[PDB]
Structure 1
Amino acid sequence: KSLEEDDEFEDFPIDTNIWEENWDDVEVDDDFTNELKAELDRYKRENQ
């Protein structure tokens, strides 16, 4: 159990793009973002 959860590498007998190119362009309407946009609307309407 300890050998599989420990941060130390396990021994074994010895014998590509992984990152989002950009996440600012890939915009997905989020719940928190919806409430934020709504707060921007409320602020825009209450202020000249």
Structure 2
Amino acid sequence: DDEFEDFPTNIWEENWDDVEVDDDFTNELKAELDRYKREN
């Protein structure tokens, strides 16, 4: 469980928002934005 037992370097993505990694959801999102612009 969560109780500790007995005892006898950066780890965070500093640049994660700026770097772009493609995924299906973003492509679907960009499809909606493109569709909206065509409508208007």
TM-score by length of 2: 0.88
Of structures 1 and 2, the one scoring higher in RCO (CA 8 A, sep 6+) is: 1
If you compute each CA radius of gyration, which structure gives the higher value, 1 or 2? 1
Instruction: Show structure 1 runs of 4+ deviating over 2 A.
Output: none
Aligned residues: 40
Aligned-residue CA RMSD (Å): 0.8
Determine what percentage of the aligned residue pairs are the same residue.
Answer: 100
Residue ranges of structure 2 left out of the alignment (5+ in a row):
none
Residue ranges of structure 1 left out of the alignment (5+ in a row):
1-5
TM-score by length of 1: 0.75
